[PDB]
């Protein structure tokens, strides 16, 4: 079988039938982290504890570094041939909550950083919100893409802390102070973990937490539930109060219609094909948006160019030629899962390097993929 796995934050997507095609094993989701381990290292245990299976491509919402790309480039590359890293689709990244009350919770972008940074302890802190009472942080544990979608965020707009917040995949490594300031902050496991600790209805309201927008909710229509998934965005803009806006996808559709493809020329480097978000725009990083849903970004597939056996390199062209297709595609399932498609100009570039023939950097490259690739 072709074996793929990591990201939770767009498990229910691999899962959903037929968006993996044929050949694919079900996506194992275990946290971008391991997901990153198994494919560099080909270290199936991070699956599971079969270590018979060969790792052939991993999900992850956190970018390769560049010592894993220089280590994957050194070590792999001249028997595997070069990793792919491209999107897969683009995300908002939710903050619901488990506090009632009848009045739309709606963070501005201050009360935000103060929830996450323990500044902001009780929710009478969150103007407008009615409720009152003590807020408890709910935050993954281990190595998470999601954390580090949403650190980058905080790391761009929480300017006005005591502390400041690295960008990390460790929550509990990411604001300068530490989680000390946070009282009683719970750490579970998993996309899973975090909603299962989020409604544990044994315990005291009052939980917040950051997810993935398909977690979060348990139909779309619950992501515009604001007694239950927060808005967040609520300001002052050119002396006029504004409303924020819930993590649906169609409220950071519009941000990502406009995040530039990487030059032709650097579409050999696996780095510039996933953008990042920043405060400014500068460097192959694009801006935060001012408008629609502030907290977004992209979640990615990491692939190989080679495989040794000639069936898996056909399957996996298969794959990239649904979920990448102008038209018989994945798009419908993606939507369905509180994702943001790819634009079309996105896929067709993807398509015109990992798949067209005559592409050096093409998947199964006759002349460059020939006596290599990633074991079956």
């Not at 998470?144 to 790391?155: I, K, M, Q």
């Not at 707009?157 to 690295?166: I, N, Q, R, V």
């Not at 899973?192 to 315990?203: E, H, K, Q, R, Y």
């Not at 990083?285 to 390199?313: E, K, M, R, W």
Request: aromatic fraction near 8%; charged fraction near 15%.
């Amino acid at each position: 079988d072709i074996n793929g796995g990591g990201a939770t934050l767009p498990q229910k997507l691999y899962l959903t039938p037929d968006v993996l095609t044929a050949g694919f094993a079900p996506y194992i989701g275990v946290g971008s982290g391991k997901g990153k381990i198994a494919f560099l290292e080909n270290k199936y245990n991070q699956f599971g504890t079969d270590t018979t299976k060969n790792v052939h491509w991993a999900g992850s919402d956190s970018k390769l570094t560049a010592t894993e790309l220089a280590t994957y480039a050194a070590d792999k590359e001249p028997g595997w041939g070069k990793l792919i890293q491209v999107p897969s689709v683009a995300t908002s990244v939710a903050i619901p909550f488990r506090k009632a009350g009848a009045n739309a919770v709606d963070l501005s972008v201050k009360e935000l950083c103060g929830v996450f940074s323990g500044r902001i302890a009780d929710w009478s802190g969150i103007t407008g919100a009615g409720r009152s009472g003590p807020i408890q942080v709910v935050y993954r544990a281990e190595s998470s893409g999601t954390t580090e979608l949403f650190t980058r965020f905080l790391n761009a707009k929480c300017t006005t802390e005591p502390g400041t917040f690295a960008v990390t995949t460790t929550f509990a490594n990411s604001y300068s102070l530490g989680l000390t300031p946070l009282a009683g902050a719970v750490a579970a496991t998993g996309s899973d973990g975090v909603m299962a600790a989020l409604n544990d209805t044994t315990v005291a309201e009052g939980r917040i937490t950051y997810i993935s927008p398909d977690f979060a909710a348990p139909t779309l229509a619950g992501l515009d539930d604001a007694t239950k998934v927060a808005r967040v965005g609520k300001g002052v803009v050119n002396g006029v109060a504004v409303e924020g806006k819930s993590p649906a996808a169609a409220n950071v559709s519009a941000a990502i219609s406009v995040v530039p493809l990487p030059a032709a020329a650097d579409r050999g480097n696996p780095d510039v094909w996933v953008p990042v978000f920043g405060a400014t725009t500068g460097g192959g990083v694009v801006a935060y948006p001012d408008s629609g849903y502030p907290i977004l970004g992209f979640t990615n597939l990491i692939f190989s160019q080679c495989y040794a056996n000639a069936t898996q390199t056909g399957q996996v062209r298969d794959f990239f030629t649904k979920h990448y297709g102008t038209s018989a595609n994945n798009d419908a399932a993606i939507e369905a899962n509180a994702f943001v498609p790819l634009p079309s100009n996105w896929k067709a570039a993807v398509r015109a390097s990992f798949l067209t023939a005559s592409n050096a950097l093409s998947i199964g490259n006759t002349n460059v993929c020939n006596g290599k690739g990633r074991p079956q």
